[PDB]
Design a protein around this nucleic acid. Structure first.
Lengths: 57, 52, 47, 58
DNA sequence: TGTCTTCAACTGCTTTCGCATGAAGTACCTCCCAACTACTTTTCCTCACACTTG
DNA sequence: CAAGTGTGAGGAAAAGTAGTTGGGTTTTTTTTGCAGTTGAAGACA
RNA sequence: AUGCGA
């Protein structure tokens, strides 16, 4: 089950982990460039749900 | 580690066979407390066919 | 194999591992009997 | 976790492999870090959702 | 009896265009499969007891 | 003191086969904008 | 969809 969830990133549970979304949690390490590989581990996201927002504040 | 606290936080999940007995009819009984005390994770291993 | 199995089941035969008698008659190792599929038909017709 | 570069090379790896990611079905995936409310500390917010609860809500 | 006025619940939308890169629902049972040891199997081999003698 | 017929079982082994188990998918039967709109309560003539 | 070229 953790391979599946970790293979899709659709973490779903009966409490919802108190999180606003059920996708997007997982990313391909995408080693096309060592710069990209290290860049992956210092990237942090505000989350998909705020990506959905129309505003810019 | 955090995970052993998590399983300490899940506590118990109890189920009764309506535990008949023939207070044992309005207090009944026979409790079954299921929980998880420890959780261990082992480093990746591969053994051939199946066992031994 | 799936086609042969399916087609035999369409005819209503029972296909399963060989019995002691079947293994003996066909000359196959008893250990391979369960892997030796046989199609049979009986009295009470299939539903 | 504790292999020196020398052993790490002896295991056919990038002599400096940082790691931290997961091999799932052979495809390298990492779990993206997320920005969430600072825990345990009351954050005073005005939100129209609060009115969206119903009448008499501020 | 008839007409007017407000509010809230519901509908429907908010770049284009292409790559990607597909993955993934599924529980109850299972027969099959792989296993370890013990037990059993087919053909073959070789000797043995008894009776009778003098 | 002795030689000579008749003759049943004990024994061996590789491979198979037994018993018990386990594994095993396969299988199969969180509002966050918009503008509008309907229905609504209440009032009125 | 995730990410991305413009």
């Amino acid at each position: 089950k953790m391979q599946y969830f970790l293979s899709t990133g659709n973490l779903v549970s009966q409490s919802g982990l108190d999180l606003q979304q059920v996708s997007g949690y997982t990313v391909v390490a995408e080693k096309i460039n060592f710069y990209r590989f290290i860049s992956h581990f210092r990237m942090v996201h505000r989350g998909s749900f705020f990506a959905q927002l129309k505003t810019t504040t | 580690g955090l995970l052993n606290l998590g399983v300490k936080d899940i506590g118990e999940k109890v189920i009764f066979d309506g535990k008949p007995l023939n207070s044992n009819s309005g207090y009944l009984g026979n409790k079954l407390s299921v929980s998880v005390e420890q959780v261990s994770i082992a480093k990746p291993m591969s053994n051939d066919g199946v066992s031994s | 194999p799936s086609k042969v199995v399916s087609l035999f089941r369409v005819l209503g035969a029972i296909v399963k591992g060989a019995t002691v008698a079947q293994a003996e008659a066909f000359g196959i190792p008893k250990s391979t009997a369960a892997s030796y599929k046989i199609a049979t038909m009986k009295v009470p017709f299939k539903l | 976790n504790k292999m020196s570069p020398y052993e790490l090379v002896q295991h056919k790896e990038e002599s400096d492999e940082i790691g931290g990611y997961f091999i799932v079905n052979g495809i390298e995936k990492l779990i993206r870090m997320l920005i969430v409310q600072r825990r345990n500390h009351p954050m005073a917010i005005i939100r129209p959702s609060f009115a969206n609860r119903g009448a008499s809500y501020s």
